[PDB]
PDB file of N, CA and C in Angstrom:
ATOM      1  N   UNK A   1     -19.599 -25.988   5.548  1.00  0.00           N
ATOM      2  CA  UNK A   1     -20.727 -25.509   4.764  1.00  0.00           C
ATOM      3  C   UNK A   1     -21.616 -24.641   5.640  1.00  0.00           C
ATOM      4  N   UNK A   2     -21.650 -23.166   4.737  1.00  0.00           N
ATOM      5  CA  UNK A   2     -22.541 -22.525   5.726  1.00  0.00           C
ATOM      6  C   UNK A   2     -23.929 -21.888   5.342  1.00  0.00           C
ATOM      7  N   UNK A   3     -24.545 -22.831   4.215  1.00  0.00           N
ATOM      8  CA  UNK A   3     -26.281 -22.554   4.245  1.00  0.00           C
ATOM      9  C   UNK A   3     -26.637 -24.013   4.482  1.00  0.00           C
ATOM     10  N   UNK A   4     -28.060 -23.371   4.963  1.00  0.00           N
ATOM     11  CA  UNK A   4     -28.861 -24.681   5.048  1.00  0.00           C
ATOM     12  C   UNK A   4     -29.614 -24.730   3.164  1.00  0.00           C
ATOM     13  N   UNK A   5     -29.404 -26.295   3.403  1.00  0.00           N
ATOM     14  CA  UNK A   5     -29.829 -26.866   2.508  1.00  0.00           C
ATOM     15  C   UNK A   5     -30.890 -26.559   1.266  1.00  0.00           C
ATOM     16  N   UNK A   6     -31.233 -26.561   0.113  1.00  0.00           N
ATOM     17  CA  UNK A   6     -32.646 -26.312  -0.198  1.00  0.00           C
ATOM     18  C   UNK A   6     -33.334 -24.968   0.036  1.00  0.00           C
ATOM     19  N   UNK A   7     -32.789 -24.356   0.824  1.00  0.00           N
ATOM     20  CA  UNK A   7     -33.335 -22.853   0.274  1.00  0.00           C
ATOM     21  C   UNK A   7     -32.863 -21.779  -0.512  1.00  0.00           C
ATOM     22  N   UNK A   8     -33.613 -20.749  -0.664  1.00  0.00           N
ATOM     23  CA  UNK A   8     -33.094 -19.161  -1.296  1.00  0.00           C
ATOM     24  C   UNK A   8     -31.812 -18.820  -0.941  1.00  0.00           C
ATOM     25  N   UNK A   9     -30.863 -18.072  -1.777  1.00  0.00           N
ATOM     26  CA  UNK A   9     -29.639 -17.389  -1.693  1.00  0.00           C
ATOM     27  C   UNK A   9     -29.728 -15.950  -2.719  1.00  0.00           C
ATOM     28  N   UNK A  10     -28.847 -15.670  -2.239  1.00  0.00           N
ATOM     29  CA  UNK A  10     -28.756 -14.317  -3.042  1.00  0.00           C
ATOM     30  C   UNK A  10     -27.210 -14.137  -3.267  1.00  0.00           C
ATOM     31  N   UNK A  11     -26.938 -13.601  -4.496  1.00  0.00           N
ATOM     32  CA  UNK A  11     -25.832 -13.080  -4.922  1.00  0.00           C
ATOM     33  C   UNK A  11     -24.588 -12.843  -4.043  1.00  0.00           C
ATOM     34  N   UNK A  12     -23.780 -13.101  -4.222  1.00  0.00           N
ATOM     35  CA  UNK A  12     -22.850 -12.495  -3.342  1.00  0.00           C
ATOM     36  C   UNK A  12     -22.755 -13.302  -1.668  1.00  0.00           C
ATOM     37  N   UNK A  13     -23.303 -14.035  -1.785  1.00  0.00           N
ATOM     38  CA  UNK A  13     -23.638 -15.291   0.393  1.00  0.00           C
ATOM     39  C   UNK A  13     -22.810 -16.131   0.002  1.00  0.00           C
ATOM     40  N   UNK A  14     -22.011 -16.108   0.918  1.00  0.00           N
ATOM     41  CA  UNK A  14     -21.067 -17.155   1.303  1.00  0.00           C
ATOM     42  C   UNK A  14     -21.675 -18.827   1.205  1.00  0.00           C
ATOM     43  N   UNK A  15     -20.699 -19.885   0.558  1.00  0.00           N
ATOM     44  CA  UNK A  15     -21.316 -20.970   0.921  1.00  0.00           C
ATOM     45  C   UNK A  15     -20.567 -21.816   1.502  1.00  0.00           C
ATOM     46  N   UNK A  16     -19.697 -21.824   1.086  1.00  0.00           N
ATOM     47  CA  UNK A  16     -18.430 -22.585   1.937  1.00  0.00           C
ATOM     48  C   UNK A  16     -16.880 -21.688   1.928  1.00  0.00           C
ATOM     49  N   UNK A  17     -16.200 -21.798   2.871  1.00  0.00           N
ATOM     50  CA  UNK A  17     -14.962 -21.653   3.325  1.00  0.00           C
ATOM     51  C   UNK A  17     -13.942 -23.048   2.838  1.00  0.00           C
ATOM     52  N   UNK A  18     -12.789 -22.896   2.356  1.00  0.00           N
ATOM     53  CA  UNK A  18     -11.881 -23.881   1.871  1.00  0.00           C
ATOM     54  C   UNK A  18     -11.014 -24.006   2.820  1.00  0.00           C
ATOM     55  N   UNK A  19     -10.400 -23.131   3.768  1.00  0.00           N
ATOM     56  CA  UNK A  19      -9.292 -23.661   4.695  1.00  0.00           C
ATOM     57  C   UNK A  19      -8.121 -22.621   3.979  1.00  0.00           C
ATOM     58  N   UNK A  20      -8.133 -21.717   3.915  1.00  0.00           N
ATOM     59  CA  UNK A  20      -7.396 -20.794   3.062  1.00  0.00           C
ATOM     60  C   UNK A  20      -5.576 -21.161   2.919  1.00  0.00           C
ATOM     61  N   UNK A  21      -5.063 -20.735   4.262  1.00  0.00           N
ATOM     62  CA  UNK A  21      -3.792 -21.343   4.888  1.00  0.00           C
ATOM     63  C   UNK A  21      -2.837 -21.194   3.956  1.00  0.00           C
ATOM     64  N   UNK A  22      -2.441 -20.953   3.078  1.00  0.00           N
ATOM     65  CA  UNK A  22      -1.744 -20.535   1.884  1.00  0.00           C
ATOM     66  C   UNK A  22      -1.621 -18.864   1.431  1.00  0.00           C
ATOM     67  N   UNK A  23      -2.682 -18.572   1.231  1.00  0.00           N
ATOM     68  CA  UNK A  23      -3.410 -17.631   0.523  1.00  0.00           C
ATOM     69  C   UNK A  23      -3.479 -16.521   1.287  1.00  0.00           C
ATOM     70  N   UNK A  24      -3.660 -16.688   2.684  1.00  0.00           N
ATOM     71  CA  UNK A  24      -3.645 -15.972   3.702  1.00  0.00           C
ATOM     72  C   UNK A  24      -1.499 -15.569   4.308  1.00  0.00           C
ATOM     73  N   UNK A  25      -0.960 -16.438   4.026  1.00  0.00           N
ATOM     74  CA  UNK A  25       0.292 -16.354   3.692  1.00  0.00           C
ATOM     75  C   UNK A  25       1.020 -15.186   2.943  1.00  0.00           C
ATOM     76  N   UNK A  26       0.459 -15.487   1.491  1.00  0.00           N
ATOM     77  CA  UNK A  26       0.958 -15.195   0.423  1.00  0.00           C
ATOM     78  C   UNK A  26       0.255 -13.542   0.604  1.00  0.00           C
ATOM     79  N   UNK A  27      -0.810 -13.363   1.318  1.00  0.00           N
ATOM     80  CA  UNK A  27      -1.623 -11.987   1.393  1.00  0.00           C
ATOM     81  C   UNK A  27      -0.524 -11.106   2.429  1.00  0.00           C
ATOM     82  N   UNK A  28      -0.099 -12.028   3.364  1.00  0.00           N
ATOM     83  CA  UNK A  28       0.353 -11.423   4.749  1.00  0.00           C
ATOM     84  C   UNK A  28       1.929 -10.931   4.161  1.00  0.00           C
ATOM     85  N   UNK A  29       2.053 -11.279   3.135  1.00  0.00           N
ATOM     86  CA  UNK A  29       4.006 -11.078   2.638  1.00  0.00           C
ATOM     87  C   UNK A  29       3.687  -9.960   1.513  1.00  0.00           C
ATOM     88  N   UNK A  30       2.223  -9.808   0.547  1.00  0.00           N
ATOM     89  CA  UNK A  30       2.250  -8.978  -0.237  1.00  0.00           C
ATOM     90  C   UNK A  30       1.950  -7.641   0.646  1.00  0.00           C
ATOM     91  N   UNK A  31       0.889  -7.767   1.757  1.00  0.00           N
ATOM     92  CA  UNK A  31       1.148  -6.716   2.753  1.00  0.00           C
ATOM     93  C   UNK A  31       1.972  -6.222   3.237  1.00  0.00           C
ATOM     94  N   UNK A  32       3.193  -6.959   4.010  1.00  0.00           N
ATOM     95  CA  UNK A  32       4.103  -6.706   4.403  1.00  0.00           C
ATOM     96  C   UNK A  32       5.092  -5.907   3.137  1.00  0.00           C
ATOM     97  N   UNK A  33       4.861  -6.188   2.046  1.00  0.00           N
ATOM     98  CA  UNK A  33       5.604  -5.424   1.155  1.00  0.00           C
ATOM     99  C   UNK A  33       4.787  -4.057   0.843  1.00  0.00           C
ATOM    100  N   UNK A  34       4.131  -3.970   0.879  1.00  0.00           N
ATOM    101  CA  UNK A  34       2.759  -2.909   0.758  1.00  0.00           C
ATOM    102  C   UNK A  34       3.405  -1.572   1.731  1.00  0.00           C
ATOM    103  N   UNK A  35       3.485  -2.587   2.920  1.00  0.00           N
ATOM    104  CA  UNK A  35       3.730  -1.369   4.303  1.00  0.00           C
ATOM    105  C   UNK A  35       4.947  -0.890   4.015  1.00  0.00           C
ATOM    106  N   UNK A  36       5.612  -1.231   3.734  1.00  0.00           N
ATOM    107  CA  UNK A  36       6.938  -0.691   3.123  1.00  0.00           C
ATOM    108  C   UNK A  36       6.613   0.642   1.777  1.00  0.00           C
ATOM    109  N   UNK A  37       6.572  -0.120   0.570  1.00  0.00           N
ATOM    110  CA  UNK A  37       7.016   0.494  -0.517  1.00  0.00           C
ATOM    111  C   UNK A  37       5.357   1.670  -0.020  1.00  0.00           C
ATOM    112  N   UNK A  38       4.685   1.696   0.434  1.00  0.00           N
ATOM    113  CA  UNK A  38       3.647   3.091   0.340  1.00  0.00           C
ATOM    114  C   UNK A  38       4.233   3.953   1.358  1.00  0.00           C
ATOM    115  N   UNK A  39       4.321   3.572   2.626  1.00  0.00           N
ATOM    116  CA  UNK A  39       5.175   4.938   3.077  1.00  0.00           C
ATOM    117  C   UNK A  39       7.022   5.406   2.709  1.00  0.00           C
ATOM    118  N   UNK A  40       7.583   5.076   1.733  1.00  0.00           N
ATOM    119  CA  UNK A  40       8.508   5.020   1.027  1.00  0.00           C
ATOM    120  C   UNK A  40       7.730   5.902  -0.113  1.00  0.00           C
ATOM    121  N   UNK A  41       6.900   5.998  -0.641  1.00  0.00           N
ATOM    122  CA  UNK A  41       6.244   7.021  -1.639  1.00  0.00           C
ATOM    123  C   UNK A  41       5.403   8.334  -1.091  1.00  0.00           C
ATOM    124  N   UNK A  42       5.429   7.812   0.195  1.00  0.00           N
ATOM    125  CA  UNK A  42       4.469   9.263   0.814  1.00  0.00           C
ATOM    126  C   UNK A  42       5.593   9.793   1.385  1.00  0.00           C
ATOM    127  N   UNK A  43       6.787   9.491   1.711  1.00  0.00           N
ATOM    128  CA  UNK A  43       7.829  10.003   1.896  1.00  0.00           C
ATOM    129  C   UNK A  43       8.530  10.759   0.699  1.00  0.00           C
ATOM    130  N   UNK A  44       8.834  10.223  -0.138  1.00  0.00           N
ATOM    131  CA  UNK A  44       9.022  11.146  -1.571  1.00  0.00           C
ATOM    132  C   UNK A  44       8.385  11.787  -2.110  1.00  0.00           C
ATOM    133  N   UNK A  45       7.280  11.727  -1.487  1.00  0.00           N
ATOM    134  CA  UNK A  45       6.091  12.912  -2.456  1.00  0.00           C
ATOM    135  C   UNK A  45       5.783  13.957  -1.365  1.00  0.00           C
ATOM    136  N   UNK A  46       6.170  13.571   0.262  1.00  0.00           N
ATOM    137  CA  UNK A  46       7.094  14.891   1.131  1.00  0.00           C
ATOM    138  C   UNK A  46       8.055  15.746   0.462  1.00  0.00           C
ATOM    139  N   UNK A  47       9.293  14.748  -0.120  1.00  0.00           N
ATOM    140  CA  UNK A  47      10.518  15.534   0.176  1.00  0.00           C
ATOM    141  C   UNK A  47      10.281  16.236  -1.747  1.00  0.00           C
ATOM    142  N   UNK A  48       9.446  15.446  -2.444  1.00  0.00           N
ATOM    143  CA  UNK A  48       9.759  15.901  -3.817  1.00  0.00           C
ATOM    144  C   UNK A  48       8.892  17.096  -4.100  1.00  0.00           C
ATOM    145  N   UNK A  49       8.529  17.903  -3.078  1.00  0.00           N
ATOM    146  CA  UNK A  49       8.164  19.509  -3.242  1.00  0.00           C
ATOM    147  C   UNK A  49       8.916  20.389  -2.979  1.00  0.00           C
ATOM    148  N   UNK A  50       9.848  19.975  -1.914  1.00  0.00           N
ATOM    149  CA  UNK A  50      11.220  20.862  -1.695  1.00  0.00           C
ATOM    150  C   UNK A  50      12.362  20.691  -2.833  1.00  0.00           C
ATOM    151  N   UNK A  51      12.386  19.974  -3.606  1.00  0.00           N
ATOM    152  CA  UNK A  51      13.059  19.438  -4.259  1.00  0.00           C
ATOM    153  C   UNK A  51      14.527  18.968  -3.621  1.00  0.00           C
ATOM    154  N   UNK A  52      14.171  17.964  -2.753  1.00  0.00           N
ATOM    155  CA  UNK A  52      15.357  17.419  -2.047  1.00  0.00           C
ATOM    156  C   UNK A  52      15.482  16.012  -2.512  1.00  0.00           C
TER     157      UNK A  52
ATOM    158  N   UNK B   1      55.297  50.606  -5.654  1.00  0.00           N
ATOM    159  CA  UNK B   1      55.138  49.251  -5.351  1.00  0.00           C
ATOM    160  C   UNK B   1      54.230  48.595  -4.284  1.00  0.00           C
ATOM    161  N   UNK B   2      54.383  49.117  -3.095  1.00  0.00           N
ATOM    162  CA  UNK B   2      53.945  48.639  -2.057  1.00  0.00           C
ATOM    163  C   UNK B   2      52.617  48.747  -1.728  1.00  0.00           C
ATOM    164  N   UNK B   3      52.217  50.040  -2.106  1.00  0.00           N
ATOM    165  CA  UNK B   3      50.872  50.673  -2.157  1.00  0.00           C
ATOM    166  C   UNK B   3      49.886  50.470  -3.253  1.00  0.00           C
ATOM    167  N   UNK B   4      50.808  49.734  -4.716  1.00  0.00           N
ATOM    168  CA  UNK B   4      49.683  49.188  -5.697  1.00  0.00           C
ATOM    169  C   UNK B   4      49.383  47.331  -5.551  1.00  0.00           C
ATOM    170  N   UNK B   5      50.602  46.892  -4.386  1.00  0.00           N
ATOM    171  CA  UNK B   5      50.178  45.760  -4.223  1.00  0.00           C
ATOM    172  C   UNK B   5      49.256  45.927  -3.184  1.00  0.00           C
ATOM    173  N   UNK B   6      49.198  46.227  -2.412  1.00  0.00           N
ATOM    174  CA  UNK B   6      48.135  46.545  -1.145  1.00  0.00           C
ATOM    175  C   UNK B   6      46.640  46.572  -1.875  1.00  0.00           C
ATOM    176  N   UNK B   7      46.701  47.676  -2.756  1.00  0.00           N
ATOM    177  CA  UNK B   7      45.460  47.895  -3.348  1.00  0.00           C
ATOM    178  C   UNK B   7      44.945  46.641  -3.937  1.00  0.00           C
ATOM    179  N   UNK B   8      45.466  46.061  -4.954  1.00  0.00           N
ATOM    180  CA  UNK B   8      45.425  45.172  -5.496  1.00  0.00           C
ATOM    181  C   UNK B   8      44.899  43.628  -4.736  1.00  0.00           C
ATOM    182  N   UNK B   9      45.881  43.550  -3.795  1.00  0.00           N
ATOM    183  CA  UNK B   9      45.480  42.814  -2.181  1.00  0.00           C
ATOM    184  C   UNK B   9      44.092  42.585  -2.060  1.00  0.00           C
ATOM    185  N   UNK B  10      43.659  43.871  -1.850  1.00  0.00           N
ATOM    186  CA  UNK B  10      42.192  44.431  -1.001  1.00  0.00           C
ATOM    187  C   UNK B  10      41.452  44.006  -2.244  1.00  0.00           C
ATOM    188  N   UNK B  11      41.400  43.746  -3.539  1.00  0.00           N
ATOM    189  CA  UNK B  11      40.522  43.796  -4.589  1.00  0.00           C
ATOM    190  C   UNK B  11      40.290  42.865  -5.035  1.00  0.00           C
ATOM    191  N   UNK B  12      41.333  41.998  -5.197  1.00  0.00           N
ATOM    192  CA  UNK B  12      41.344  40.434  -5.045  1.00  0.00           C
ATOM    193  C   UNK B  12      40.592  39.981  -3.918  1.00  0.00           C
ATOM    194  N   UNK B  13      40.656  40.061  -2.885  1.00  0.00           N
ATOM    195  CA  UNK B  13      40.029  39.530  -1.474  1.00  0.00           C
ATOM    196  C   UNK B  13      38.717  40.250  -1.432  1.00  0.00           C
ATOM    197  N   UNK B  14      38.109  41.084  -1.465  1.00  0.00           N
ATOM    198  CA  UNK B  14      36.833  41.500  -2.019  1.00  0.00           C
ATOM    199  C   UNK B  14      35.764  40.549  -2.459  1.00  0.00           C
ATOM    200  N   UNK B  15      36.158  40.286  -3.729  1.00  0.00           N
ATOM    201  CA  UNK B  15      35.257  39.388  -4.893  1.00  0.00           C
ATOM    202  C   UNK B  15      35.624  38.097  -4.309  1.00  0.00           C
ATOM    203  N   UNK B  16      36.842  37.805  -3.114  1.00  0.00           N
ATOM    204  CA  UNK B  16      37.165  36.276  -2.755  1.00  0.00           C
ATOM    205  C   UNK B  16      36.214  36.230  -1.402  1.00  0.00           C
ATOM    206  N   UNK B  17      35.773  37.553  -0.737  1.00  0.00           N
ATOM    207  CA  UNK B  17      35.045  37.279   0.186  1.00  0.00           C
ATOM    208  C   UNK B  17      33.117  36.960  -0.457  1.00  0.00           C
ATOM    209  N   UNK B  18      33.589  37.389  -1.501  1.00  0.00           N
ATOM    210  CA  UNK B  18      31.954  37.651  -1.936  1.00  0.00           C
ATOM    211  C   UNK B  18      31.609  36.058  -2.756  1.00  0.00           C
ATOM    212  N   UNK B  19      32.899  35.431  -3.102  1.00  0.00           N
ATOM    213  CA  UNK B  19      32.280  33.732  -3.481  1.00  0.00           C
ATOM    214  C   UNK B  19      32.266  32.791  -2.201  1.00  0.00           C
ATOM    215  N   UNK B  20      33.356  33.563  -1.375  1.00  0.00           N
ATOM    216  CA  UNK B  20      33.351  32.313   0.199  1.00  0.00           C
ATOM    217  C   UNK B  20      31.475  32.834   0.654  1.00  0.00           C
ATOM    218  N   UNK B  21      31.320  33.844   0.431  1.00  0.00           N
ATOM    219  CA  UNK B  21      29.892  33.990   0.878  1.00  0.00           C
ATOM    220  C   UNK B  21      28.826  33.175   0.105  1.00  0.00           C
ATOM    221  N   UNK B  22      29.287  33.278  -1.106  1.00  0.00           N
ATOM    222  CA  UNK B  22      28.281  32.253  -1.913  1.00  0.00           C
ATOM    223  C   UNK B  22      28.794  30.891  -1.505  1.00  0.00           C
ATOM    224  N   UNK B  23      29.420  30.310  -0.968  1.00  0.00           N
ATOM    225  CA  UNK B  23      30.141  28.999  -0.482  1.00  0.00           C
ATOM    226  C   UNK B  23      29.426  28.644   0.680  1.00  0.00           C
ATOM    227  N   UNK B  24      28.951  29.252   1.703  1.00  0.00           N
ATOM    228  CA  UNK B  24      28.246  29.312   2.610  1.00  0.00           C
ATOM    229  C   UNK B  24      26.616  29.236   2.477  1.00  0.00           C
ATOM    230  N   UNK B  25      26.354  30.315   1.474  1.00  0.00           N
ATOM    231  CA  UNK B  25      25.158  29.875   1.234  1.00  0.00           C
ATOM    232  C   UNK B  25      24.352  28.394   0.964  1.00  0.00           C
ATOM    233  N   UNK B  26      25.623  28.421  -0.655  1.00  0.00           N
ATOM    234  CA  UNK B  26      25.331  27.162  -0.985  1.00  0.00           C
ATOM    235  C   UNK B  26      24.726  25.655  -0.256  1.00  0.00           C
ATOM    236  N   UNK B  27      26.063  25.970   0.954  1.00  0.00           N
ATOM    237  CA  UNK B  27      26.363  24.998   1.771  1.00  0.00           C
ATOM    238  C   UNK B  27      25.234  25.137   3.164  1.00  0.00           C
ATOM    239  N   UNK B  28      24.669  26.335   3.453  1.00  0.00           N
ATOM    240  CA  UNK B  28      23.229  26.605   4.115  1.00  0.00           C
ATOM    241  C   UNK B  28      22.181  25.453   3.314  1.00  0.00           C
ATOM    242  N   UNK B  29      22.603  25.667   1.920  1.00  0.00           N
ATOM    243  CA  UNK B  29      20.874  25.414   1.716  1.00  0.00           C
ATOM    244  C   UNK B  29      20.797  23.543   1.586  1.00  0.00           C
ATOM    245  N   UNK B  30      22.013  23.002   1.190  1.00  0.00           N
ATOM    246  CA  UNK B  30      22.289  21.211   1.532  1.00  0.00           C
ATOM    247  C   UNK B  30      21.815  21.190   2.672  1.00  0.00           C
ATOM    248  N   UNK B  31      22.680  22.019   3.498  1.00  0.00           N
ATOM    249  CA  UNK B  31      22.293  21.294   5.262  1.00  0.00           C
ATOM    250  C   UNK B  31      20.829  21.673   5.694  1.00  0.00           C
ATOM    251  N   UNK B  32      19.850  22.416   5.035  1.00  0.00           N
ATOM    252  CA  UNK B  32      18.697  22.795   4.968  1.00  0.00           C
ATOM    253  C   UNK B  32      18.063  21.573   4.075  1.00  0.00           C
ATOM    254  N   UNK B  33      18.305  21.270   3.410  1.00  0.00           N
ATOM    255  CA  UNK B  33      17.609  19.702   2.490  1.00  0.00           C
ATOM    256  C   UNK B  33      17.797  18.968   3.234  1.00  0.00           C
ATOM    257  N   UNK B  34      19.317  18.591   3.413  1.00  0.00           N
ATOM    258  CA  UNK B  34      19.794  17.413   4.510  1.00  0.00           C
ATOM    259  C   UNK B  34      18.852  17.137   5.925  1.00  0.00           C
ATOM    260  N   UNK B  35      18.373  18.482   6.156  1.00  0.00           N
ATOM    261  CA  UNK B  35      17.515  18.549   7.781  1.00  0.00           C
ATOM    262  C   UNK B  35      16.161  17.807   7.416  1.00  0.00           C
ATOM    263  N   UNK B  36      15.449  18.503   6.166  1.00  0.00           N
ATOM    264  CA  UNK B  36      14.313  17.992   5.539  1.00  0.00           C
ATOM    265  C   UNK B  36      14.280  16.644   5.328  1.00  0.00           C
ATOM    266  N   UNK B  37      15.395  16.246   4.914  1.00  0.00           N
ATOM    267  CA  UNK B  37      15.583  14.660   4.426  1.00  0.00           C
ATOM    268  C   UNK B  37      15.423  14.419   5.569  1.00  0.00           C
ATOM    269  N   UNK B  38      16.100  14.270   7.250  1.00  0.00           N
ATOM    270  CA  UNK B  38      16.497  13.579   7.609  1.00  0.00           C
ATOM    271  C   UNK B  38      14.984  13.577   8.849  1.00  0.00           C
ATOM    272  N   UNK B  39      14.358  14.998   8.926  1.00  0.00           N
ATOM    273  CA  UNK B  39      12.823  15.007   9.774  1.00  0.00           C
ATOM    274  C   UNK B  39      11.590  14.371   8.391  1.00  0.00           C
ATOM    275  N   UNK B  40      12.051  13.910   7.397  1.00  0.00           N
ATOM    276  CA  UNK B  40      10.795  13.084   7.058  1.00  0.00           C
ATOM    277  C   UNK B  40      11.427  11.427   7.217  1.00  0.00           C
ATOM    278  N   UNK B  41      12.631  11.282   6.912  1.00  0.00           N
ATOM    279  CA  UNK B  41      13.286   9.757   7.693  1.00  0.00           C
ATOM    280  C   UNK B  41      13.593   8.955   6.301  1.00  0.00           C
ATOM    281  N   UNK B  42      14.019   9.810   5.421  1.00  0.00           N
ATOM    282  CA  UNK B  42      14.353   8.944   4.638  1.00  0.00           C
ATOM    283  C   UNK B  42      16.203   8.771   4.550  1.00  0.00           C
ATOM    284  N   UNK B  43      16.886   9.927   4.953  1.00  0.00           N
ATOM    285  CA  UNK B  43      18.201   9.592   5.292  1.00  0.00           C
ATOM    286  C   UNK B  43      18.521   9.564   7.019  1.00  0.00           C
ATOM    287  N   UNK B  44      19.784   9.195   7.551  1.00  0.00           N
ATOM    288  CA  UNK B  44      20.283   8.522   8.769  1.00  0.00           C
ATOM    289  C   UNK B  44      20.595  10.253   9.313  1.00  0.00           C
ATOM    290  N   UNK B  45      20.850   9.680  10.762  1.00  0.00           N
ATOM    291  CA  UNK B  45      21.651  10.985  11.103  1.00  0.00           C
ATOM    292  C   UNK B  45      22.789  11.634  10.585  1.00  0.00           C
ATOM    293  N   UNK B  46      23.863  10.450  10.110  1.00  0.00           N
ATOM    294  CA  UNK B  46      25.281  10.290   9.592  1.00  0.00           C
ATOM    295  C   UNK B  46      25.452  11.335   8.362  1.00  0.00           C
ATOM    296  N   UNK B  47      24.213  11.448   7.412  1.00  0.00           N
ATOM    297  CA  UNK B  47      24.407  12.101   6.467  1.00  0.00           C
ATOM    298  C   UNK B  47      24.151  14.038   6.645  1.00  0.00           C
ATOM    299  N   UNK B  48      23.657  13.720   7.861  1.00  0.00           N
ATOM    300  CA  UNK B  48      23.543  15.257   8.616  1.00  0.00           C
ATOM    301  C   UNK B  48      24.496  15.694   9.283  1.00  0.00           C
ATOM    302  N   UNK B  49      25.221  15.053  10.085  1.00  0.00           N
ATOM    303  CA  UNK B  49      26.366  15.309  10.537  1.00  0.00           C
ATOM    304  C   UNK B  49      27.687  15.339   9.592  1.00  0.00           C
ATOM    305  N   UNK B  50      28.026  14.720   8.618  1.00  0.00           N
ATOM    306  CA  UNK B  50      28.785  14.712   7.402  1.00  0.00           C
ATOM    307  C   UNK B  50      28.687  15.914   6.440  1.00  0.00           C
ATOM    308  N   UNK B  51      26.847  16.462   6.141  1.00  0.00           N
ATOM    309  CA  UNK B  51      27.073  17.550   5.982  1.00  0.00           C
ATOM    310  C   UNK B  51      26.964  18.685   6.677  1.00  0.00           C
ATOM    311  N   UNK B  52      27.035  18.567   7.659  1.00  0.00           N
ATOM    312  CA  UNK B  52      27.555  19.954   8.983  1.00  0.00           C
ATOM    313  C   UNK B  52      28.757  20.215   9.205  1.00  0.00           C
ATOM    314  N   UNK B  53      29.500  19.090   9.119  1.00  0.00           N
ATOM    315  CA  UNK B  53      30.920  19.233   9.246  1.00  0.00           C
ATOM    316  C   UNK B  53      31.498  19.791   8.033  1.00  0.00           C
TER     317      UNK B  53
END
C-alpha cells in the first residue's frame, strides 16, 4: 500500500500494486510478437512501392 | 536455293535476337527485385543466387 492513510488523492494515484507476475508475462510474449509482425510490415510497405 | 535460305536464316535470327534481348531484360529486372528483396531482408541469399544463375 502506497498512500498514507486518511488523506486527499486525486484521480489517476496509485494505491496499491498486486504482484503482477502473470500479466507481466503475458505482456512480455504479446511484445515479443509485436517485434516481429511490425517490422515484417515496415518491411512490406519498403518492398510494396517497388512492387516486389 | 542457297542464297534464299541464307536470307531467310538472317531473318529468322533477327526477331530471335530481338526476344533473347527481351529475355534478358526481363530477367534484369527479377534479379533487380530479387536484390531489393534481399537489401530490405525479407528473402535469403539463396533466392539471389538461384536467380543469377
Amino acid at each position: 500500500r502506497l498512500f498514507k492513510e486518511g488523506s486527499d488523492v486525486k484521480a489517476g494515484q496509485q494505491l496499491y500494486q498486486i504482484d503482477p507476475a502473470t500479466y507481466e508475462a503475458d505482456y512480455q510474449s504479446a511484445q515479443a510478437n509485436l517485434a516481429s509482425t511490425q517490422e515484417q510490415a515496415q518491411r512490406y510497405k519498403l518492398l510494396v512501392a517497388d512492387q516486389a | 536455293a542457297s542464297v534464299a535460305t541464307a536470307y531467310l536464316t538472317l531473318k529468322a535470327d533477327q526477331a530471335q535476337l530481338q526476344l533473347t534481348k527481351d529475355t534478358l531484360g526481363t530477367y534484369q529486372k527479377s534479379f533487380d527485385l530479387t536484390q531489393r528483396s534481399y537489401d530490405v531482408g525479407v528473402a535469403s541469399a539463396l533466392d539471389l543466387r538461384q536467380a543469377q544463375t
